[PDB]
Amino acid sequence: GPLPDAKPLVEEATAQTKALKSAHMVLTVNGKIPGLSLKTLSGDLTTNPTAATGNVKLTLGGSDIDADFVVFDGILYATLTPNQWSDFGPAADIYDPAQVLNPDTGLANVLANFADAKAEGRDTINGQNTIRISGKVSAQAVNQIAPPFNATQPVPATVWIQETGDHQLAQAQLDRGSGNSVQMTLSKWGEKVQVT
Ligand SMILES: CCCCCCCCCCCCCCCC(=O)OCC(COC(=O)CCCCCCCCCCCCCCC)OC(=O)CCCCCCCCCCCCCCC
Numbered sequence: 001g002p003l004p005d006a007k008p009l010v011e012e013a014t015a016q017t018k019a020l021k022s023a024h025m026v027l028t029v030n031g032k033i034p035g036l037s038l039k040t041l042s043g044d045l046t047t048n049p050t051a052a053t054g055n056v057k058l059t060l061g062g063s064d065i066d067a068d069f070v071v072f073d074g075i076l077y078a079t080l081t082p083n084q085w086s087d088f089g090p091a092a093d094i095y096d097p098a099q100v101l102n103p104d105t106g107l108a109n110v111l112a113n114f115a116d117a118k119a120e121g122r123d124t125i126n127g128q129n130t131i132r133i134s135g136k137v138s139a140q141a142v143n144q145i146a147p148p149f150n151a152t153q154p155v156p157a158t159v160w161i162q163e164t165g166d167h168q169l170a171q172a173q174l175d176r177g178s179g180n181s182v183q184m185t186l187s188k189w190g191e192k193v194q195v196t
Pocket of ligand 1: 025027035036037038041043044045052053054056058059067069078088094095097100145146147148172173174182183184
């Protein structure tokens with residue numbers, strides 16, 4: 001049947017995202033984004049205070065490493081060899097994961113700077129009906145959430161917003177062209193992170 005108007009849905013998702021404290025996130029990098037050596041990540045994030053835990057697949061020196069990670073008390077830790085925790089210092093010197101849910105600079109700021117929104121279709125994301133929406137995100141909003149994009153123009157993007165219910169952002173993708181793109185799927189909004 002007919003699609004809703006994207007614009008009110010984006011506005012509603014913006015407000016919902018600003019109110020978020022925590023979520024489960026799955027992040028995938030498709031192709032190659034210069035200065036991003038991550039391939040995948042899956043984890044749980046809470047904010048105020050910031051903590052995160054999960055697993056990451058990343059490339060270091062031409063090799064893919066699977067690692068568990070914890071961010072706790074500003075500090076990033078990861079197991080670059082199995083069951084061995086290394087301390088990598090302040091998480092903020094690499095990337096503070098709270099930035100993803102910062103209401104001024106994170107996903108909500110992406111949504112508020114998502115231009116030309118148009119509903120394209122319906123898709124299931126994690127068992128929920130969502131509206132797939134195309135648009136373009138400002139360079140400045142992209143660079144603030146994902147510095148390695150190094151955008152000097154608007155970035156084509158797709159968002160998937162819950163059709164009913166709370167209208168959360170279920171998924172977002174930023175396309176750097178060719179077959180190079182970053183996507184995040186969010187779920188379990190307001191989960192207790194558990195702790196670390
Ligand atoms: C809608 C889309 C939403 C997108 C939201 C998030 C987008 C991603 C944010 C961009 C990350 C920017 C961080 C710098 C990029 C980096 O990779 O450095 C490149 C250097 C090579 O680049 C350079 O040459 C120099 C950069 C200096 C980096 C120093 C590295 C020190 C080595 C030790 C790190 C190993 C532990 C990492 C475990 C995570 O080699 C490295 O890869 C080593 C560092 C790996 C960092 C992984 C960052 C994790 C992203 C977390 C956000 C996801 C949400 C979290 C939810 C829980």
